[PDB]
């Protein structure tokens with residue numbers, strides 16, 4: 389029923405290793421390129437009401 | 440022309456211009472706005488305006504003496520201008536103003552009136568002068584938590600806490616012997632000034648200004664002062680430039696000169712030899728810009744400030760400007776370098792050799808405070824002639840190509856995008 393079984397499991401090993409490494413690398417790059425926006429700060433002194 | 444210099448603890452440096460009709464004589468201290476903690480900030484501005492106070496200016500104007508002052512990041516100055524026959528009167532007045540006494544300038548009424556006036560001037564600067572407050576916030580965020588970030592003008596929250604004790608404490612720690620250079624420019628001789636200083640005593644103090652614990656370090660950041668009730672969008676943007684006493688000083692200035700300055704309403708300004716204008720004039724992206732190469736004692740800034748009303752196309756302005764900046768690293772031509780040489784010779788000779796003696800006094804005082812002697816203009820022109828295209832490409836690869844930037848903006852800057860697209864536009868991805 390499953391003549392592909394051997395090659396299916398070794399290609400599964402390759403694919404799971406490469407995609408786990410890509411997933412962790414992409415988590416790093418998302419935390420990297422969002423670092424300017426996570427740490428952004430806002431202060432607010434309310435303006436002069438005469439205008 | 441010639442610049443001489445002598446020493447006795449004070450430093451006496453002159454420029455005898457015998458063709459001029461006035462003579463500026465004044466002391467240029469080596470402290471500035473970069474030597475204040477953020478709680479006594481604006482004390483140099485307040486010394487500027489008690490020196491230019493009404494009673495002091497009246498006593499000056501009785502003898503025909505006009506006062507002048509300047510507060511920079513590195514250097515203060517206190518210049519007294521007069522006719523060329525009254526250099527002794529100017530020296531004796533400067534002696535009586537600073538050295539002989541300070542309590543009559545620092546009376547209660549004079550100090551309170553001057554504090555009121557400078558508080559008015561700082562508030563008027565804060566809510567009405569927009570490109571200069573953009574440049575001050577650009578310094579305040581490029582060099583943050585570091586003494587070169589402090590504005591020369593002072594802040595409203597600090598300046599209303601100063602009393603006379605802080606003025607006297609700054610005077611005792613910074614108005615010193617080795618910290619100062621007494622400068623005479625205009626129509627005076629050097630020997631006359633030295634013999635007249637030695638005729639008096641004119642000893643400011645013992646010496647040794649406090650040493651800053653932290654050196655200036657550039658820090659890529661941004662600050663956005665968004666005010667939707669303003670008609671324009673003012674924005675400065677700069678990288679870490681070259682300080683003075685650097686071998687890349689004139690190269691940084693010539694790189695600023697390549698892209699020059701621009702005013703969209705002047706007809707002769709729209710016809711300049713800049714390749715940025717072909718991109719910028721089609722849809723009228725800005726009203727004006729200027730490229731600046733600011734150089735301080737510890738660090739510097741290189742970038743451009745601009746203003747625009749086309750508030751929906753600010754990102755296109757930043758985009759084409761930064762692609763032109765990326766042309767410096769890769770493919771800047773020979774003709775652009777020759778044009779920037781000629782224009783920088785022109786504006787540098789206008790700056791150092793204008794007719795106004797107080798500006799010569801400020802520049803000579805700053806230069807002989809920092810680097811011990813004034814580089815005359817002929818050697819400056821030889822150093823400008825020595826620059827090649829490879830020097831500009833090496834400098835741009837060192838300082839421009841994919842380096843952190845500092846951004847400050849106010850007005851209708853919603854069209855200005857995030858930090859990351861402006862940062863990522865510093866490298867082209869095509870080279």
Ligand SMILES: CCCCCCCCCCCCCC(=O)O[C@H](COC(=O)CCCCCCCCCCC)COP(=O)(O)O
Pocket residue numbers: 399402403404406407
């Ligand atoms: C065209 C859309 C196809 C998207 C497939 C995504 C589903 C994940 C399972 C993929 C398994 C099929 C490939 C395979 O068996 O390779 C196996 C290796 O595993 C992988 O490398 C898959 C990594 C997937 C990365 C996706 C990159 C994005 C490419 C976009 C298209 C240009 C077999 O390798 P091999 O034949 O030995 O060279």
